[PDB]
Amino acid sequence: TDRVRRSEAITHGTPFQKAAALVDLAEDGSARYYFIFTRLDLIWSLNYFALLFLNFFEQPLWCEKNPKPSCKDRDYYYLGELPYLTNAESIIYEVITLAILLVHTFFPISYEGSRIFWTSRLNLVKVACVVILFVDVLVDFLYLSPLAFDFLPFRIAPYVRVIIFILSIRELRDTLVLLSGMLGTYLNILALWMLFLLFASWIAFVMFEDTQQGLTVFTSYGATLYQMFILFTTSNNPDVWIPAYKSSRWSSVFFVLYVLIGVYFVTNLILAVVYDSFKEQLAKQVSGMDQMKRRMLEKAFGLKNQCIKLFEQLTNKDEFADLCQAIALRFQKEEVPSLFEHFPQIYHSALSQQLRAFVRSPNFGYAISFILIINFIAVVVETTLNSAQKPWQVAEFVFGWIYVLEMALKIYTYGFENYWREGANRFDFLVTWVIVIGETATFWIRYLLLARMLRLIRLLMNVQRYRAFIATFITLIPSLMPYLGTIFCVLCIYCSIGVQVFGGLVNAGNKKLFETELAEDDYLLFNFNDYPNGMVTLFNLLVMGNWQVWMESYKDLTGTWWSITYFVSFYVITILLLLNLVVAFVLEAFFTELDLEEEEKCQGQ
Amino acid sequence: TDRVRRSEAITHGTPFQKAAALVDLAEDGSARYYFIFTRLDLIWSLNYFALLFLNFFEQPLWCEKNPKPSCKDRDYYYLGELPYLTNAESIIYEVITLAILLVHTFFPISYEGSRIFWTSRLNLVKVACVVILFVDVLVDFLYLSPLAFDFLPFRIAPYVRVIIFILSIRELRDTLVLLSGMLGTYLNILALWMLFLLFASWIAFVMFEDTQQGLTVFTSYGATLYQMFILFTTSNNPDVWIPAYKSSRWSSVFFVLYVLIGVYFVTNLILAVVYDSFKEQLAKQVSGMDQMKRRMLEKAFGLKNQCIKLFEQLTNKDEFADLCQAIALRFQKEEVPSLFEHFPQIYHSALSQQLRAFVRSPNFGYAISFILIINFIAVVVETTLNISAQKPWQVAEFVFGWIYVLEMALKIYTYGFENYWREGANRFDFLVTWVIVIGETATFWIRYLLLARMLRLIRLLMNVQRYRAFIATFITLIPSLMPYLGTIFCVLCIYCSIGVQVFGGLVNAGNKKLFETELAEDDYLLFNFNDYPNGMVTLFNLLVMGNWQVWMESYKDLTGTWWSITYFVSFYVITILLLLNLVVAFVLEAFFTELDLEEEEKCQGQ
């Protein structure tokens, strides 16, 4: 009842209650209308997701330019398995999600007020984008009628959807303010990297000029620079320099020195610079949150007798902020009473506490781990077979009951809340329900095998040593999520670009295609013909095993070197700036875990 | 004259000179015999290198089994270009390097004292290695005579050579001692990684069981585990899961998820762990060095006139340790008199100081760098014409060469030899300029002169004040990584030995299986283990991870035995996950040290 108590105290409470609520929620990290707005936050979140995802199901723009065969022949164009919305459906969902977007974007006026609403850059830009969207939707609708428009060259909506998405989920916007902080420092190292590629490709071009390497690979400075760029990635190693090696073994000493420097001395320098600027910008950013927290505590101060009255509320200016911080850092948050303490003879009679202490014992935990080991053995046995298996449906129900009981005993020992407040106990909760639902619905086969597999993670989580690594992993995941989301938004952009520029080129009637490395390596389903296909392709480009295959093949399908700029800038932005950020984040998380246990050790000693 | 002064002050000087030398050399980081042993250090180093390199030119043992055709047919066996030593040559060089090694390893037996010598375990292990080597050499010699032996199954010398080389250089031996502590950490994380591969391969196996992915790729648990291990490296992406994708696009979700987790979450974890353990051991090592430095200074103390008598020689108990620290850094250390001071009136004639001050001027720097820009433009014009027109540029190479000679002459005229060579930039200048002067004077084969004129450009990067921060990091990282790249090289050497013994001779033009392998299909046939060079390059290829499973598949198929994979798996586990992560860590620490040093310079200026 924390949120309800806070909002009630803020909107109706006496000033000491308002101050207590403000300080409590600052420690936890027109008020009425702000609450009314926030009560729809799930609607906003889901609508913005829908808004994005509806990008996946729209028909790709080249299918409307009357191809033969038509896009009903998905085998000819190597197309995905997702449906394409009809005109009707498109119109429907466009209208619905634009209407809810218009509701959300203007609803803050109820507490911000017009002068602030128009004074504020974020609202001004969101209104700009939703107008852009509405314009484009209108235009699209009009294009229903041939009177309005003959033809559309380009669709802006796919972009604006993405933009809108990024502006809606604040943590993505703050990640982009961090990234646009470090970007200017990243451009200097990217310039020194390009100066390195230039000079190394010029040495290679002079050195091999008349050789078979020059005659068949390094045929010009441009092609040398291209090849050396690829070799920076290591992706064309050794293939690129086989002609060299053939003519003289000594050539290897050049290719080895180039690879060693590029990979070891330079790529790690790019990581070091990204790591440094990330850490600086992160420290810069958190200071803003700390300052806003102080401003909120100063508001609570404004809104010895007063100290006694506030401590009385707590039972439920610089000195004030210092006291609030001291109590926040010293004290755990207050206990919440369970729904069962109201039954005096039931909840409180000594048998209850005896069973609680028993289930709270460590030897109970050992026994539970042994029972789950026995279940793991049982499933590893059962998967030797697939009617003799039928009793293992009873074994299924048996372990189902076992986990139902263990979940019940956990909620009995700690209420609903202090059971669940550990993320592992949340995983327990989820897998218990899903497997109970599956087993009772059976009373998929393979999917129940998979789920019972998935439940085995418990034995990993239990390992005391590994549990440090796992705690790193666990805090990492939701901390990583806004960076992978930014990556994904980038992929979305790139995908859109790709389908507009390259969509339709990979098809079974194309005589050039069967000369390309996509046809030769059988990558033909990794194409930009629709939004799914592209997305997957982009993942291959991201992990970057065989990446140059696509760059090459689309060079050859489009007939212009300019096409390369796509793949190059993709590489630059994704591989260098963002994945090194991911690296740095993982590193910092790990070391933070070690600093945490080091602090615990120091304070204990 | 530092070393000569120090050694004289120790072996002949008065105790005040002894202390002054011991403190100065400790700030700089039986005495007679130890100085002799150190003066021979170049001969020892060169002998140990020679001893190592021996591995390259020795004929590979499978050639000694009289194959048909013989190893004179290098095209049939895709062999290298290096010579193989004759028996005669082998015997010669072996005997010479063994004799010099015996000399070096026994040399301390006199000055260390027998009880001390044999009490030290490093000596004892070196003696075991040399005794082994001597044995093996003796055996090989005996083998010359039919009375001794019929056959030898395996040669140990190749290994022992490496071991001796590792022992011979303290920088490497300390690098391996540092490496040895973090191993027990490493084995943890390695265990967890194995467990993850196991689980993920099980899921993949069951999940795909009946599918085309199953029916063609994930044919068994074993086959699944092997393919999932290569997919952790991402070298078989997307190829390993094309049958899944073809069957159902949704399949992609599993492989994306798995690759995401493995590459980003888990590989970074191994890096993290490596990093951590590295830094811990590095701190332990530098602490041990600091303690040894203190222990030395404490003996130099054990060896107001109390102060003045030593503070005079300082121009050449915690109270003392503090003084030694302060005097190491609060003042500029000493300088050596120039060879010109036997002609001091000319050397001191005012024009010398005036020209030195001019050469020290910033406008002289501007002029010289403008001349370097002119030379860069000149060589660009030369190459953009050549792509007899070079003959004026062949003449201009005279001018440029003697300009770089003259400017180096002015550098030494302003800084002697001592403050010249004390600067790494001037050391690089010295390293390139004289060899280029030799090449160009010998000109007064052409592309090597063009390339020299290009290598003269390298300073233009180092002079950019922004990029100078990165380039200082790079310039200190170059000599600092040498222990670690040397240890990796030693590892490679071992692996190469193994490879030539186990796989040498299999890649040959008569082999019917070979033309079915991915080696032959990708034209990799030159990247083989048939001789030591070949294998070395192959190992490089392995190290770089480019197409690396090609070799593991092809040698699996050529040997017809799964066990062969143990070679390539152990190689990956050692090199890729332990060593290269180390290298990573080292570069990150170097860069952050550079930023801390610059921040200290900034804050002290502020």
UniProtKB/Swiss-Prot annotation, chain A:
Lipid bilayer topology: Multi-pass membrane protein
Vacuolar side: 63-90, 150, 210-215, 231-252, 382-393, 494-530, 546-566
UniProt keyword RNA-binding present: no
Record PROSITE patterns: EF_HAND_2 (PS50222)
Intramembrane stretches: 216-230, 531-545
GO molecular function: calcium ion binding; identical protein binding; voltage-gated calcium channel activity
Documented activity regulation: Inhibited by Al(3+).
InterPro entries linked to this entry: EF-hand-dom_pair (IPR011992), EF_hand_dom (IPR002048), Ion_trans_dom (IPR005821), TPC1_plant (IPR044581), Volt_channel_dom_sf (IPR027359)
Protein location: Vacuole membrane
TM segment ranges: 42-62, 91-111, 129-149, 151-169, 189-209, 253-273, 361-381, 394-414, 427-443, 444-461, 473-493, 567-587
Protein name (record): Two pore calcium channel protein 1
Organism: Arabidopsis thaliana
Lineage of the species this protein comes from: Eukaryota, Viridiplantae, Streptophyta, Embryophyta, Tracheophyta
Name of the encoding gene: TPC1
